[PDB]
């Protein structure tokens, strides 16, 4: 029964391993193994549940084990395994073949098979851990082994993509351990993890690997959010080492998502407004990306309300995610109408929900934005309005209070008006008629730059796949 | 069936005129009982779910209607099924003999024509849609496929389907050659004009329901007085004052309806007050029309105040071009408008850039800004220009 179960799943794993083995042996092609590894994550997730854990036991028996002798026993010890007589030395798939990792040349140590085996061995370990959700000692045991192994290898062009996806599981397993249970050992454990990120990033800077650095930057910027250091994030993004060429679309959306939250504390939303919009256009619409589209839209509504301008109202109802976007609608309504008591009761009921996404602090600063937006609304209605006429609307305190809040709104060039105290009314200095100025000419220059930007990229993207069809023989 | 679904939704929300609640409650228990439709008496409970002023009395005693029981029971259900099961036995008996004979394409198509109307009158929706698939292969000429469009339109008016019904409406009307056929173009001025009310069009609907021929009588579906009522709805948006005095006021089609039924107060009272630009007589005709026209109709009350906001900004724009500077107290005593309610009316438009107006509260005067400027026209091209470049960049990177 259990004998035929191990031969079926292992043959499918070797069949996929032999495909990428001959691709890296001929010259240098870095895109051939990458296409299979994308589907390998989905195929292995469903395959690990079937036939239990016995598919990876004989895989260690097949290939020679440099480090893996005691790693499979410690993984099966936590589950209190039963002895099926799976002891190595029974199932042999090698049988002295060149593609089978011939044993005699391997045992004599005249050839090195460890490069394409041991590096691939760590990949299958992290896949089974994410399915069973194992924590505590099993997380630290794997992280301690991989770090010296990566420093011993030279990290060739094809070797940089093997561990590129392993860093995502290292950071994920460490964060889920701290949120589940907090202790004093978890704090000092992250200290070593912060040093390991910078040591490997410096090595990958020489190879200029596009996918490797794309995964690191996403994990490094996210670690600064929990650590709470802006100087580490500000100096990191100043180098601009992130390639835009071969990185995946899912990795691009995560990059622009961090720049929106970093620039949000600098009180400059001009650049941050583009990063949050570009992150949505680069994020897939599938179900696996719904978690990112949910968090990205929550930040988009908060950026516009902090700019003094009301965002698009139809964005809530047209989308199907508005169930979680309902609290943000009451925030926009309270700022636009200008009611002081409505804003206090708005954030009170949802105060518990605003703590998870850490957007409650941005909601506290909306208290002043209620008046900032209310002044712009009443200014467009009345070009010349008296001093006591505004207090009768928003129910402000005194007449001197409303007079000094308008002078602050013109600091950034929002209202663009003047206050005449001798006459007793506030007059708007904006006559429009900007068609006679040079201001629209500056915006029109960027539209030509944006049009010709995609023209050069059009020749690069379309012509590249036609290179292989010329050399290949056709009928 | 008659009117499809109207009287069923008359009891949904009624602000005034409680006497209409009794008439609407007696009509829903009359036609449905007289017709052969079994299930449409059961849907009365599902239509009023989560609504104010429900006419269904089960767990909620707040019903204000005189007839509070719309609820489905087994007394009327058993009586309607006996008539439905008896006729389907006779229809399936005669048609089955024609299927085995297979003489001509007329008897094969006409057999499903009587069924397409029958399954709609016995309360079968999805079962009637399968009857069109068999009649499609048995179609003879282009006119045979037109009857399929009627079945899609008739069955689509119950739930107000704007997707499959609206798309298949223009497909049958086009096909290979459109032409001036009365079985297509005339139905294009009616069925398509109904779907424009649910999507809030008011532009293309004004080019059909307003300017058209003098009859368009669909009998069971719509009547002449019903279609003529919506002529003043979409006609006050796209059509300017030049077309209001021709295709609305002086149009002979609406002249006979004013002298017949004067209770509409839409094509007459609203058009004369708007043409004269007199706010004194324009105000009292807004509440009278909103109550007796917009609220009872199903394709109107869904808009209601949304359509009222468009009528008010129309008269404010006409008077804006009639003067430059005017005192607020002078206009208040002229057209009979209050000062307190004047600030709230102009506060829902000016900040939205709907109308450009300047008001000086020191002297209590209103000014007139520039209605059209060169920079104001280019600002609309910014969103339209960037809106196109967004699709070209987003969809261009998706396919690569």
């Amino acid at each position: 029964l259990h004998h035929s179960e191990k031969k079926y799943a292992e043959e499918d794993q070797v069949q996929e391993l032999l495909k990428v083995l001959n691709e890296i042996s001929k010259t240098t092609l870095t895109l051939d193994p990458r296409y299979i590894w994308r589907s390998l994550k989905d195929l292995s997730s469903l395959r690990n549940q079937e036939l239990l854990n016995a598919e990876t036991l004989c895989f260690t028996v097949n290939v020679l084990y440099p480090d893996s002798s005691s790693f499979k026993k410690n993984l099966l010890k936590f589950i209190t395994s039963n002895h099926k007589s799976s002891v190595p030395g029974s199932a042999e798939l090698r049988n002295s073949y060149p593609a089978s990792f011939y044993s005699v040349n391997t045992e004599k140590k005249t050839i090195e098979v460890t490069a394409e085996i041991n590096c691939f061995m760590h990949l299958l370990v992290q896949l089974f851990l994410w399915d069973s959700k194992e924590l505590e000692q099993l997380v630290e045991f794997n992280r301690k082994v991989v770090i010296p192994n990566l420093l011993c290898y030279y990290n060739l062009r094809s070797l940089n993509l093997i561990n590129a996806k392993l860093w995502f599981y290292i950071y994920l397993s460490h964060e889920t351990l701290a949120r589940s249970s907090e202790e004093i050992n978890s704090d000092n454990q992250n200290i070593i993890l912060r040093s390991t990120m910078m040591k490997f990033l410096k090595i990958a800077s020489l190879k200029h690997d596009n996918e490797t650095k794309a995964m690191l930057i996403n994990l490094i910027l996210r670690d600064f959010l929990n650590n709470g250091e802006v100087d580490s994030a500000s100096d990191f993004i100043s180098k601009l080492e992130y390639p835009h060429t071969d990185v995946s679309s899912s990795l691009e959306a995560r990059y622009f998502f961090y720049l929106s939250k970093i620039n949000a504390i600098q009180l400059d939303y001009s650049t941050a407004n583009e990063y949050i919009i570009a992150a949505i256009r680069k994020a897939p619409h599938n179900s696996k990306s719904l978690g990112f589209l949910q968090q990205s839209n929550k930040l988009h509504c908060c950026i516009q309300l902090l700019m003094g301008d009301i965002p698009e109202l139809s964005f809530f109802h047209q989308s199907n995610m508005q169930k979680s976007l309902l609290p943000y609608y009451h925030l926009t309504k309270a700022v636009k109408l200008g009611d002081l008591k409505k804003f206090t009761s708005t954030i009170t009921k949802y105060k518990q929900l605003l703590l998870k996404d850490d957007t409650y602090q941005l909601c506290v600063r909306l208290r002043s934005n209620v008046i900032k937006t209310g002044i712009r609304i009443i200014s467009l209605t009345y070009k010349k309005i008296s001093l006591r006429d505004i207090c009768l609307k928003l129910n402000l305190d005194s007449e001197q209070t409303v007079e000094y809040m308008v002078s602050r709104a013109i600091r950034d060039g929002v209202i663009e008006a003047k206050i005449n105290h001798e006459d007793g009314f506030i007059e708007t200095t904006e006559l429009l008629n900007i068609y006679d100025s040079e201001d629209p000419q500056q915006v029109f220059d960027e539209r030509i730059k944006f049009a010709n930007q995609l023209h050069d990229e059009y020749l690069v993207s379309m012509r590249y796949p036609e290179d292989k069809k010329t050399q290949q023989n056709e009928k | 069936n008659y009117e499809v679904s109207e009287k069923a939704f008359l009891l949904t929300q009624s602000k005034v005129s409680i006497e209409q609640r009794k008439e609407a409650a007696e009509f829903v228990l009359a036609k449905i009982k007289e017709e052969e439709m079994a299930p449409y008496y059961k849907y009365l409970c599902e239509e009023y779910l989560v609504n104010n002023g429900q006419s269904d009395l089960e767990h909620d005693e707040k019903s204000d209607s005189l007839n509070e029981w719309i609820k489905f029971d087994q007394e009327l259900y058993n009586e309607l099924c006996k008539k439905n099961e008896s006729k389907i036995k006779e229809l399936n008996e005669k048609i089955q003999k024609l299927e085995e004979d297979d003489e001509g394409e007329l008897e094969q198509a006409q057999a499903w024509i009587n069924l397409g109307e029958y399954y709609a009158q016995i309360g079968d929706k999805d079962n009637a849609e399968k009857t069109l698939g068999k009649s499609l292969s048995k179609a003879i000429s282009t006119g045979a496929k037109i009857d399929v469009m009627l079945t899609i339109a008739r069955l689509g008016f119950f739930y107000n389907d704007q997707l499959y019904v609206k798309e298949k409406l223009e497909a049958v009307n086009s096909m290979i050659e459109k032409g001036g056929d009365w079985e297509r173009r005339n139905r294009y001025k009616t069925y398509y004009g109904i779907h424009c009310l649910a999507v809030r069009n008011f532009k293309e609907a004004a080019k059909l329901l307003v300017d058209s021929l003098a009859t368009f009588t669909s009998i069971e579906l719509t009547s002449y007085e019903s279609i003529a009522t919506y002529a003043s709805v979409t006609g006050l948006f796209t059509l300017e004052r030049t077309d209001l005095k021709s295709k609305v006021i002086d149009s002979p089609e609406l002249l006979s309806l004013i002298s017949t039924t004067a209770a509409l107060q839409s094509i007459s009272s609203l058009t004369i007050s708007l043409y004269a630009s007199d706010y004194a007589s324009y105000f009292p005709y807004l509440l009278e029309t909103y109550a007796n026209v917009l609220i009872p109709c199903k394709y109107l009350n869904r808009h209601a105040d949304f359509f009222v906001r468009e009528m008010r900004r129309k008269v404010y724009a006409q008077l804006l071009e009639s003067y430059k500077t005017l005192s607020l107290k002078s206009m208040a005593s002229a057209f009979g408008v209050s000062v307190a309610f004047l600030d709230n009316d102009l506060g829902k438009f000016i900040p939205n850039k709907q109308l450009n107006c300047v008001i000086d509260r020191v002297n209590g005067i209103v000014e007139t800004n520039r209605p059209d400027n060169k920079n104001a026209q280019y600002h609309l091209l910014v969103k339209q220009g960037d809106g196109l470049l967004t699709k070209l960049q987003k969809y261009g990177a998706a396919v690569r």
């Binding site: 109202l313 809530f316 | 509440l287 105040d305």
Partner: peptide
């Protein structure tokens, strides 16, 4: 649905009939 169906209206209901009060009294 730009600036219309999202915020609805929620006005001009009981305040419209109240306008005729000041019209039939002060005049």
């Amino acid at each position: 649905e730009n600036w219309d169906d999202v915020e609805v209206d929620d006005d001009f209901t009981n305040e419209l009939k109240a306008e005729l009060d000041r019209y039939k009294r002060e005049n």
